[PDB]
């Protein structure tokens, strides 16, 4: 139930602590800060080289045409899912989806954010966001592990069959135990890719559930 | 090392023996049986529920043309890759690597087969097919359990970067450990799926290595 958030900037570092920890993962989360880096094709290179399901982190946020493009993209490159904004609307939304329908993959709904500028517009748009993402078919989505009555409140909206991901543990003072009685994977990335050693980070992140 | 050949034509029963040797498998092999049976969208209900990596063994063995819309609707369904004949030739092999580009997935080019008949035509083109692959810039191979000589000759061509997996363990008899001397992994299926305990089999297959 550990999926690590891989936002570390250079390869070699990037395989070195993904190698290191792949025993207590299942998934790799990819993000903009290592493909602008590095390039699209480090998402081909690291399904190959460990065999992790790669989430892409893209937070598309684009009019409809243009997330059907970034999409697509992604896709192509080997994406196995995309995370994607709901704030910008259902037809957004459904672009992604509809991409992800033509290529077998998947899309991951963004309803509420973990940082504290969250609360300014995205919380109160949260709920409707969330019931949106029920009406369109999502059966994925992302929610704060900084917020486990916001958490516990998205679970309700989407239901128990629906997967529920959550980022902002540790770093960001997010509990593991405490996410996962909502989410169904937590998301981590500094408090392991910054460890003195990250196999010990996960390991230990993993007995305290 | 262990790839399940599910090959039971009930939805129901399918789901029930992959379920129970999830621990000791990475992958799932789906062939025509359970396809032409259960419908396309079998494929994405395995990934979704048990989260292994799905090969389609397919056998693609038509025109470019056709091979090119085979390999779009696999992909489309949510396969991970391919497997494809190379005796019809080059341009019915780029043809699937074509498609695998632009969807961001993979082929594997099956070189020799496993039965005894494979021996009529197939053999005598096993090495030269081979080469295409390695040619055409195929990493994927399947080659035969039954005739290890015949694997490592396959292995000496291809190299050791490029991954091979081989059918024909236990029903066709093949050696579990002998055909892991020269394959990355090993495909099984009546030996599981047809066992009083397919769980005990895929533990007894493994603790045999
Ligand atoms: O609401 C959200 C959505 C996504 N992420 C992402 O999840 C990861 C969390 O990293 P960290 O705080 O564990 O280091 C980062 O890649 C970040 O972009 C969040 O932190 N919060
Ligand atoms: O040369 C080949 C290529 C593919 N397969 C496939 O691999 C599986 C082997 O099943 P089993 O003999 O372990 O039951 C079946 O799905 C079959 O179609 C072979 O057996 N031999």
Same mark, same amino acid.
């Given at each position: 139930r550990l999926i690590l #958030? %891989? !936002?570390?900037?250079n390869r070699d570092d990037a395989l070195r602590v993904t190698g290191e920890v792949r025993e207590y993962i299942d998934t790799v989360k990819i993000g903009y800060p290592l493909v602008l880096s590095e390039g699209m094709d480090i998402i081909a290179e690291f399904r190959k080289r460990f065999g992790c399901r790669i989430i892409a982190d893209?937070? $598309? +946020? !684009?009019?409809p045409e243009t997330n059907e493009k970034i999409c697509r993209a992604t896709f192509k490159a080997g994406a196995d899912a995309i995370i994607v904004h709901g704030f910008p609307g259902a037809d957004s939304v459904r672009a992604c989806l509809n991409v992800a329908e033509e290529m077998g993959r998947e899309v991951f709904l963004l309803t509420e %954010?973990?940082?504290? *500028? #969250?609360? %300014?517009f995205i919380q109160g748009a949260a709920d409707e966001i969330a019931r949106m993402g029920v009406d369109l078919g999502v059966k994925n989505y992302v929610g704060p592990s900084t917020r486990p009555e916001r958490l516990s409140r998205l679970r309700e909206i989407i239901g128990q069959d629906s997967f529920l991901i959550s980022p902002g $543990? *540790? #770093?960001? *003072? *997010?509990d593991p135990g405490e996410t996962l009685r909502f989410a169904d994977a937590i998301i981590v990335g500094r408090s392991i890719?910054? +460890? !003195?050693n990250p196999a010990a980070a996960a390991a230990g992140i993993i007995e305290s559930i």
């Amino acid at each position: 139930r550990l999926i690590l #958030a %891989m !936002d570390l900037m250079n390869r070699d570092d990037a395989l070195r602590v993904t190698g290191e920890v792949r025993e207590y993962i299942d998934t790799v989360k990819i993000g903009y800060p290592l493909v602008l880096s590095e390039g699209m094709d480090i998402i081909a290179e690291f399904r190959k080289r460990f065999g992790c399901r790669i989430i892409a982190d893209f937070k $598309v +946020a !684009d009019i409809p045409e243009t997330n059907e493009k970034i999409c697509r993209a992604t896709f192509k490159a080997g994406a196995d899912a995309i995370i994607v904004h709901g704030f910008p609307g259902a037809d957004s939304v459904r672009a992604c989806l509809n991409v992800a329908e033509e290529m077998g993959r998947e899309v991951f709904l963004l309803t509420e %954010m973990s940082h504290p *500028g #969250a609360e %300014m517009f995205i919380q109160g748009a949260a709920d409707e966001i969330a019931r949106m993402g029920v009406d369109l078919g999502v059966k994925n989505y992302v929610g704060p592990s900084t917020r486990p009555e916001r958490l516990s409140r998205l679970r309700e909206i989407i239901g128990q069959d629906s997967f529920l991901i959550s980022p902002g $543990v *540790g #770093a960001q *003072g *997010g509990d593991p135990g405490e996410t996962l009685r909502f989410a169904d994977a937590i998301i981590v990335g500094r408090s392991i890719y910054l +460890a !003195d050693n990250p196999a010990a980070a996960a390991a230990g992140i993993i007995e305290s559930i």
